[PDB]
Amino acid sequence: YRYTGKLRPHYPLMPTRPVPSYIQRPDYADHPLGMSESEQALKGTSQIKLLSSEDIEGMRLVCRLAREVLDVAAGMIKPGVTTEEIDHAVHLACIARNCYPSPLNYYNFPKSCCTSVNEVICHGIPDRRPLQEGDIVNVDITLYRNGYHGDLNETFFVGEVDDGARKLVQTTYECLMQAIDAVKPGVRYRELGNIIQKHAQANGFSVVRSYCGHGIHKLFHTAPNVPHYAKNKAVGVMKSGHVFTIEPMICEGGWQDETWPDGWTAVTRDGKRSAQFEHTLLVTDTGCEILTRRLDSARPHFMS
Ligand SMILES: *C[C@@]1(O)CCC(=O)[C@@H](OC)[C@]1(O)[C@@]1(C)O[C@@H]1CC=C(C)C
Ligand SMILES: [Co+2]
Ligand SMILES: [Co+2]
Ligand SMILES: [Co+2]
Ligand SMILES: [K+]
């Protein structure tokens, strides 16, 4: 394999971390290939669930806990910490909240979170590499509690970063929030990418096309698919009671991606940097509830 930038994987990985059996597990956690037969049974649909009041309380809970776990990871970002050390803290933080770390064994993903440094677009595997001053790193968290998943991510600065990194991360966050500010009953899901791309392109950046926001509730991913680029063909109209993510991946150079031989790590083909932010949203009767928001502080960690 010809690497696209300076990053390399730092092996070996630790053996997979067990989750105590008192923690409730999603179907795929015990499947030998990590397949989710509840996702498979619904493979085949654009129909979107309307959540019950019961489901809304379960989503509110797991999303608040997921935010608490992202905040634990945020407090670890400093030069010299390895991404495996971040993952270990996340794993234990999930278990302390009586939650399963949804990534773990999902289609045999080997870790409890994704850590995406520099040219990694998404799904980076925590490994032995120490963070370096000047890096940007995304940590993506998903928890499972009482049959519900909750999903969020933020990009962080590692010590001092250059102006390009600041502009990329700020723009990506602004893309997410402009999209969120448009969510309300009656808006087509395909509109959000028109908003995102407009702001990215105005700032000289590109939008990843191979990954999208997703419905999330009893399944980790389900309908709707929410592309982040303009003039997409997404199906559906937002209604109160829909729950889904918005998770734009914005790149310094071109938008084209490729995957490492590990089968997960998505990188820019040109080796330039990418950033991402994500929230889980509930559509309400007149707008949206940001389930994964910070309750205690005004701004994302990179601005705090
Ligand atoms: C990791 C991911 O959430 C990125 C955005 C997607 O496109 C979404 O798929 C709809 C994902 O690719 C997801 C949910 O398929 C992967 C599974 C997740 C994990 C964390 C290893
Ligand atoms: Co799946
Ligand atoms: Co997601
Ligand atoms: Co995520
Ligand atoms: K990145």
**DSSP letters of 270-288?**
T---EEE-BEEEEE-SSSE
CB 273 within 8 A of CB 135: no
b or e along 225-247 (b: 16 or more beta carbons within 10 Å of the residue's beta carbon)?
Answer: bbbbbbebebebebebbbbbbbb
Q: State how far the Cα of 164 lies from the Cα of 140, in Å rounded to an integer.
A: 22
| Cα of 278 from ligand 3 centre, angstroms | 7
Q: 169 is written with which tokens?
A: 């991360």
Amino acid at 297: S
Q: How far apart are the C-alpha atoms of 150 and 291, rounded to whole Å?
A: 8
Whether residue 165 contacts residue 157, with contact meaning beta carbons closer than 8 Å, is answered with yes
Phi first, then psi: what are they for 96, rounded to 5°? Answer: -60, -25
247 marked ligand binding residue: yes
Mutate to test the pocket of ligand 1, among 87, 102, 214 (most ligand atoms within 8 A of CB): 214
Q: Which pairing describes strands 279-283 and 243-246: parallel, antiparallel, or unpaired? A: antiparallel
**Among 282, 182, 212, CA closest to 240:** 282
Ligand 1 close to Cβ of residue 111 (< 6 A): no
What distance in Å separates the CA atoms of residue 170 and residue 164, rounded to the nearest whole number? 10
Rg (CA), the chain: 18
Bridge pairing between strands 257-259 and 206-207 = unpaired
Cα 70 to Cα 115: distance, rounded to the nearest angstrom: 11
Tokens of 33: 């290939």
From CA 25, how far away is CA 145, in angstroms rounded? 8
Q: What is the CATH number of the domain that holds 278?
A: 3.90.230.10
With a 6 Å cutoff on the Cβ, whether 211 touches ligand 1 is yes
Contact 7, 117 (CB under 8 A): yes
CA of 251 to the centre of ligand 5 (A): 9
> Which residues have a Cβ under 8 Å from the Cβ of 275 and sit 6 or more positions away?
136, 138, 155, 168, 169, 172, 249, 250
CA dihedral 249, 252, 258, 259 (to 10 degrees): -70
Query: Which residues is 138 bridged to in the sheet?
Result: 116, 155
Structure tokens at 45: 């649909």
Q: At residue 39, what is the residue type? A: E
Tokens 């998404």 appear where? Answer: 122
Question: Cis (ω within 30 of 0) for the bond into 15?
Answer: no
Q: Under a CB-based contact definition with an 8 Å cutoff, are residues 142 and 106 in contact? A: no
Reduced to 3 states (helix: H, G, I; strand: E, B; else coil), residue 238 is coil
How crowded is the C-beta side of 280, counted as CA atoms within 13 Å? 28
- Token readout for 16 is 């997979």
The count of residues in the chain is 304
Instruction: Count the Cβ atoms, other than its own, within 10 Å of residue 36.
Output: 19
Distance CA 161, CA 163 (A): 7
- As a whole number of angstroms, the distance between CA 195 and CA 140 comes to 23
| CB neighbour list of residue 299: distance below 8 Å, 6 or more residues apart | none
- State which approach was used to obtain the coordinates: X-ray
Determine which residue's CA is closest to atom 19 belonging to ligand 1. Answer: 103
**Cα–Cα distance list, 98 to 25, 66, 103, 113, 117 (Å):** 11, 11, 16, 16, 29
A 10 A CB-CB count for 3 gives: 12
Contact 247, 180 (CB under 8 A): no
Q: Alpha carbon of 45 to those of 35, 39, 49, 225: distances in Å?
A: 18, 10, 11, 10
Range of the domain at 127: 1-304
- Give first-to-last CA distance, the chain, whole Å: 39
DSSP line for 26-82: -GGGGSTT---HHHHHTTT--------HHHHHHHHHHHHHHHHHHHHHHTT-STT-B
Structure tokens at 71: 């905040």
Q: Assess whether the C-beta atom of 123 lies below 6 angstroms from ligand 1.
A: yes
- Helices 163-181 and 191-202 pack at an angle, to 10 degrees, of 150
3-state helix, strand, coil in the chain (%, to 5): 25, 20, 50
Q: Is 114 in the pocket of ligand 1 (CB under 6 A)?
A: yes
Q: Is 25 helix (H, G, I), strand (E, B) or coil?
A: coil
Task: Tell me whether the omega of the peptide bond preceding residue 130 falls within 30 degrees of 0, making it cis.
Answer: no
Does the Cβ of 39 fall within 6 Å of ligand 1?
A: no
Sign of CA dihedral 25, 27, 28, 33: positive
221 marked among binding-site residues: yes
Nearest CA owner, ligand 1 atom 13 = 221
**Tokens linked to 113:** 């979170």
Domain tally, the chain: 1
Pairwise CA distance, residues 138 & 191, whole Å: 25
DSSP 157-184: E-SS--HHHHHHHHHHHHHHHHHHHT-S
Nearby residues of 23 by Cβ (< 8 Å), 6 or more positions away: 95, 98, 99, 100
Task: Work out the angle at residue 141's Cα, subtended by the Cα atoms of residues 117 and 181, and round it to the nearest 5 degrees.
Answer: 95
Burial status of residue 40 (CB atoms within 10 A of its CB: 0-12, 13-18, 19 or more):
exposed
Let me know: does 90 contact 69? Beta carbons within 8 Å: yes
| Resolution in angstrom units | 1.1
3-class DSSP assignment, residue 153: strand
DSSP H or E segment with residue 198: helix 191-202
